């Protein structure tokens, strides 16, 4: 549909040879070559879409003779063009594809006969094929092109199912329109190398989901179109479909796979540059595995036609076992996840690319670093491409900023334009002249200069975008043009490229060089006008958070370290009482996100507590430490058991038992919180082999799943502890420290109850008895804390305080079990009880702020107001 | 390619050793495979020296004209246009036949390799004519000769194996690469 | 050709002869002139020939077009209509003007490709339909590679353009609807 693509017959008419007898001009169009020999391995040879029941048996001599049998020339260009009956018919030679049943000039096998127009006769006496009319039967095979433009004719490939075959995006690589997203390569190169492997072959992989390393693989494979590779794989290539031939790609089954299966038999035949895109045998097989046009190939693997495919993570295992004989013919490797700098390279790589769309620079550095965060913020999604998601979310946040315009006036449209509404809104009411109620005109005096600046402001992105248009366009089109240089540079072709490429590099780039330098800011922001438009990553990043959990600004705040580095001494503030644990923990803490010793290993404390006491407190505090997250909640139970753990273990079973969660219960959690800490008590009571199930949970607390998953840790953490003590727990005398007593229960219980496991394991920690003073103030701390969360404001105030009940509260404060942690209720109720009455009456929604006068207690509370 | 035995063997050993759970052939078969693997792109022609020295073109290529018109000192533009094209013309040359005569003789390998490829095929087929009974047993089997057909072989790529470029003959190295691979 | 759906605009030929029948009528007229619309015909009111379709703006060709086929000789209900000399009139002219549109079969607007030497009531630029630029050219100008599955709007290229049942947006509340 453009040029040079093909002429099925017509390309062989005068072009089967250059100049010998001057055959290019004769009555038939068959001259330079006639259909090769009497079959189509060439232009319309023998039986073809010319027709099945109508074809030229002697037409080779018949069409090619009137075509050429050439000494009708007088030179190698014996005539202007190659004029003849069919030759001068070249008006209708292209017309061979012109009317119904033919395509454009011609195409496929329909490229063969019809473009020839007159041959064997003009049309007089013979049975030879057909084009747009006589091909009505053959229009299935030699016809069916339906796309005459942008793609090379090349081999016959008549009929077939070509789009809905599959896709070689090497044509989009011809387009280039894909994304040269690179750097994890050797594996491919290996794989590539591994693709060449005889005996068995066809490696297939995968780690993280979904966006198709294939083209990625094709990328170098296009570079192998550029021929990275020895001839074979160099002479192999591939076409992408798995689905689309799916249940729409046929009415119902049975050609469905088959047409394909037949189509296999096309490609199989001395046809280089043929390899088979698959994604997922996952997608294949099934419940009631379909044989999915597939197992047959493991036979038919026999001849030729290697392939590609992808192989998930756990399920790849769930594949692996189905058949190894199946396996036995297709090679298998798998994939790793990049990150950070790896990603940075992408992060590096990409910034143009959706600038190449959305057209926004940012400093982007922190923005990069936002990823890992944002990564760590919703990392279940595929880290880079989720990080890629940010790249959107970025430009999202930008397009946010953008809307119409970037964000200044479309904002200021709130004023300047609504002040330009003030310019003409009131233009006519009852009367507007000089002194009247009609306020219209005055806005026109001011906003002009303002609304003028809109115009640069408009330009500032626009005229920059104007420039930036080309900017994106510039190397883009070089990436066309230097690919159009690269058009053939990989054949050891050179100057055809360099020809246009001469100065084209140092002009575009010079324009770039010219235009890139161009700023026209006052100096507004940086080297530009509106490009970052005024767009701050952090804030988008914030907006990211402001999409994602929000709760920002500490998430603006990160020196995880420094933040922490006080936070101990700070959360000390948060601390209820006993300090060194923190201090201990703090070490571990700092040590923790420090790591720097083991990638694997988290840390746990003996953290010997009292009910609720700090015990819970730790958790939330701890929980409150990492981030605000209260979500972080994790714990166990089935310490009660003998043989149970299924949900309680992770793995459950394989599929086929209660829930397919298989600890997904704990694991979706495990999924949904890379980073946490665990306790569960009864750990004292804990089922021992469960502790052997705990065992691994440790360094090497890495997951196993009923699907075969694996975690790592120190990601999350644990301090799972108990009380289990009494003599110390009850020790009364002594609170902090006191004696090596501490050791006794401590020394014992573990070594008493528990093995060298522990000796591996981390840390050993305790509570301390309570100090009515140290106790005391903790009182309002919660109660202080109370009014706080209240989402409303009137009263919202201090009230009682002093000591009056505090001590009643203390007298009701810690009791040798708790009489402490519960008090909240036991407190609040009273409190609730009180305010209820008042929140009933609410004598003033402000004022309030009293303290209590108050049975044999000489107590029992309430309050005046 | 060529092959050094003992490696393969010894390969198999710890192949087996280092990877038991591929069965006694298999692991080797994998070596056997993977041999060809590390071989494989190693049989890409000069993959580094493919793209490496090729650049000398593109380095000086565009400037063959892009200097022809350029804003520089007058006629020194053409000088740098000339003097690098000089080194583009010249420096190309030292490898310019040279890279082929690798690949040439590599082909000469792959040539003879195809005779290596060839011989057996026939020899197979030659010995399938034993299924032609004793009629075509030795008849064809004589026609295939081999006094020389291998005297061809290991005396042919002999030289280019014999000839070391500087050393090691082919950077193709194509042979067993003892562990390495 | 024209199409499988040619019934409608193609139905008006015997309808043109509907006064009394015809031994045949002629490809000088048909209700496809009016098509489905009571002014200029879909195309030569809007669809194809609205803007550029030359003659028969609204009532131009169709208003008086019926003079040819009106009334029978003796026809209680013997016969209706037939192209006769027009039979092959668009025959090649139906499948010629398509070229390659990314399409399937013969076109009535493809039959609208070349119009006719003279079959019509109108003088514009020729004895052919409307005036000039319409049909295959107008359609090709106005559209391409799209008609209908096996068929389409009766006689004429086709008023059908957008996806049958649309539920408006732009113009939906453009009126505040
Ligand atoms: N090396 C790379 N450099 C830059 N971007 C990359 C790179 N590899 C992948 N990407 C991006 O990630 C997507 C590529 O699809 P992939 O996801 O990498 O293929 P894949 O086989 O599905 O890997 P998964 O399974 O989707 S995570 C595209 O959006 C690319 O922009």
Short mmCIF file of C-alpha atoms and ligand atoms in Angstrom, two decimals, chain A residues 179 181-184 206-214 216 346 382 385 388, ligand 1:
data_model
loop_
_atom_site.label_atom_id
_atom_site.label_comp_id
_atom_site.label_asym_id
_atom_site.label_seq_id
_atom_site.Cartn_x
_atom_site.Cartn_y
_atom_site.Cartn_z
CA UNK A 179 9.64 0.67 24.80
CA UNK A 181 13.16 -0.89 28.35
CA UNK A 182 16.44 -2.52 29.07
CA UNK A 183 19.16 -3.68 31.44
CA UNK A 184 18.08 -7.11 32.71
CA UNK A 206 9.04 -15.72 35.07
CA UNK A 207 9.03 -13.86 38.38
CA UNK A 208 6.80 -10.80 38.91
CA UNK A 209 3.64 -10.60 36.71
CA UNK A 210 2.35 -9.49 33.62
CA UNK A 211 3.73 -6.80 31.46
CA UNK A 212 5.45 -9.22 29.17
CA UNK A 213 9.22 -9.41 29.05
CA UNK A 214 8.54 -11.00 25.71
CA UNK A 216 11.43 -7.04 26.25
CA UNK A 346 14.45 2.54 34.48
CA UNK A 382 4.75 -5.40 40.89
CA UNK A 385 5.91 -1.65 37.19
CA UNK A 388 6.07 2.47 37.08
N1 LIG D 1 14.61 -2.91 31.59
C1 LIG D 1 13.56 -2.10 31.69
N2 LIG D 1 13.76 -0.78 31.64
C2 LIG D 1 12.70 0.03 31.76
N3 LIG D 1 11.41 -0.29 31.90
C3 LIG D 1 11.26 -1.60 31.94
C4 LIG D 1 12.23 -2.58 31.83
N4 LIG D 1 11.71 -3.84 31.90
C5 LIG D 1 10.42 -3.62 32.05
N5 LIG D 1 10.08 -2.31 32.07
C6 LIG D 1 8.75 -1.76 32.18
O1 LIG D 1 7.91 -2.76 32.71
C7 LIG D 1 6.99 -3.20 31.70
C8 LIG D 1 7.62 -4.33 30.96
O2 LIG D 1 6.88 -5.51 31.13
P1 LIG D 1 7.36 -6.49 32.18
O3 LIG D 1 6.48 -6.34 33.32
O4 LIG D 1 8.79 -6.13 32.54
O5 LIG D 1 7.33 -7.87 31.44
P2 LIG D 1 6.90 -9.07 32.29
O6 LIG D 1 7.30 -10.35 31.71
O7 LIG D 1 5.39 -9.05 32.47
O8 LIG D 1 7.47 -8.76 33.67
P3 LIG D 1 6.29 -8.72 34.61
O9 LIG D 1 5.89 -10.20 34.69
O10 LIG D 1 5.16 -7.91 33.93
S1 LIG D 1 6.66 -7.79 36.26
C9 LIG D 1 6.79 -1.99 30.83
O11 LIG D 1 5.82 -1.12 31.38
C10 LIG D 1 8.19 -1.37 30.81
O12 LIG D 1 8.16 0.04 30.69
#
